[PDB]
Symmetry: C2
Subunit: 323 residues, 2 copies
């Protein structure tokens, strides 16, 4: 169920019950991309400006935009008046020396402060290995309970992003991980759909690596179209919450093709929180050719990208209202 | 204002609006006391047992008991039927290699789990130097906001304990700290009485080191009685929340005389969360003579301490229900 304010907030993040959200809370990742044509270390001014350019030019075509409080608050204030705002709550990345990947909130932030900054949702990223250390997962579950409680008190939607992994499989893109991905994703969704975690929307991976599915694979084939289709249906059955897809390790085209396949298979996903593929190109242009060039790229190539995505969403997504 | 459930919980922790609570969530501190008396490391069983003995013998004379989830859950189950339960939420102690003393919740606990474990309040201890690093304090304030929000969502009273310190003063028993203690205590109370922190009751230090007050001092005198009295009045004017005193491990007699002085000075404190001043002597007995001897100490010296404290509370404390 949703409280009146949470419902209203959800409405501000979507169009006709579909979430077509632009993800741009990248921090370290964006800086690194920038580093790729580096006269110097990329500045705070540069990072914040590029987020503002993307926000200004592309949010007229997105139902909402996800930003980080570190670099993204200026960008958040210049978003289209028709677009809602989500703010990221987690610290980026994880310790590569250990396998625990424990969650940690931004040090001077709280759900209250996120709401005060104008957000209509709190977004939090959790790494979860359902088969991992039981004590680690207990600590993780407790952490999410806390955040869910915060969001209930502040009456602001809780968007929980889950990225799955295996403590013992180094590469998420490996065939080894592909074989267990459906299990990692769908079981994690079952866990955090439980009422006690206070989640309003799940941001999740597609439950299969399409690069190993028949018809989509350029190399080894691990799954038939039917087995992949069943994974999407299993995922649909793993939660009664609204859920939306993230894009990871795939091109814009493959992602869009996957949304088509997802819908064809019977998945009732309620939209996406996608970004990188849409605005990636603007980054090279911005560093090299300046902000005015980047603005033009976003107005042209940028619009093309997000518009193609929206037209795919129009024929594949299902409304969260239709619960 | 209290919600219906918070009020009911406050009622279970109090009698006629006065909190006569027994504090025994000590961990590191208890371990240190125990250290003073034996060769070996204290065992889990010994810590759990002594906590259960104090709970069994003394909670018939307290309106509630504060315990720690780590060693205190068995003790919580054998408390008097008439006594309420608070559970601690913070990890014990602080990092002595730095001056920030940052707060940290127990890893596998949440406010929801504390409530599920039968507690009628969440207690959290924060070290705070009002004059300290501003970024450190911003992080501390954000952290308390989160907990206050949790407690609002779970509809469970939030007891915030504040222990003051100075980043540049090593010993809080020193005359140097004594001269700034009132400032540290009263300004901290003011800050954490702000609505945004969601506190229901403050557990605080008396705003004076009584050992340096004329009439109480056996050595150097830093303060006249009128100056000490004014600090208590300043404290009363620093919050409109209920507040209760901790004993800080002074003698039972000095704590009792302090409460009388507080009341005479004009402090409208609403009770105590008193630990060491009551049961401290049981530790030596339990270690050296065993549980039965400790039980007999509690039934005699322990009772005498808490009985005389209750008599003093009866004539000094002010009801929270008058608010
Ligand atoms: Ca107020
Ligand atoms: Ca007052």
């Amino acid at each position: 169920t949703l409280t009146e304010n949470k419902r209203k907030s959800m409405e501000k993040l979507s169009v006709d019950g579909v979430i077509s959200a632009l993800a741009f809370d990248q921090r370290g990742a964006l800086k690194r991309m920038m580093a790729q044509h580096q006269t110097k270390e990329p500045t705070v001014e540069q990072i914040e400006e590029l987020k503002s350019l993307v926000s200004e030019e592309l949010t007229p075509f997105a139902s909402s935009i996800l930003l980080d409080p570190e670099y993204g608050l200026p960008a958040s204030r210049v978003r289209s008046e028709e677009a809602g705002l989500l703010l990221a709550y987690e610290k980026t990345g994880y310790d590569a020396t250990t396998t625990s990947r424990l969650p940690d909130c931004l040090d001077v932030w709280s759900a209250k402060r996120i709401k005060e900054a104008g957000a209509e949702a709190v977004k939090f990223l959790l790494y979860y290995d359902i088969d991992g250390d039981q004590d680690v997962n207990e600590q993780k579950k407790a952490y999410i309970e806390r955040i869910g409680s915060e969001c209930r008190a502040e009456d602001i939607p809780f968007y929980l992003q889950i990225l799955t992994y295996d403590e013992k499989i180094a590469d998420n893109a490996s065939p080894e991980f592909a074989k267990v991905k459906a299990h990692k994703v769908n079981e994690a969704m079952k866990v955090f759909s439980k009422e006690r975690f206070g989640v309003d929307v799940l941001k999740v991976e597609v439950p299969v690596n399409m690069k190993f599915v028949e018809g989509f694979a350029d190399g080894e084939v691990l799954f038939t179209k039917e087995e992949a289709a069943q994974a999407f249906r299993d995922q649909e059955a793993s939660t009664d919450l609204p859920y939306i897809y993230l894009s990871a390790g795939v091109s814009a085209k493959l992602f869009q093709d996957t949304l088509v396949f997802a819908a064809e298979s019977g998945a009732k996903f309620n939209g996406v929180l996608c970004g990188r593929a849409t605005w990636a190109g603007s980054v090279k242009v911005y560093i090299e050719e300046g902000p005015q060039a980047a603005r033009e790229w976003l107005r042209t190539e940028g619009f093309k990208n997000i518009d193609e995505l929206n037209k795919v969403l129009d024929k594949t997504a299902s409304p969260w209202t239709e619960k």
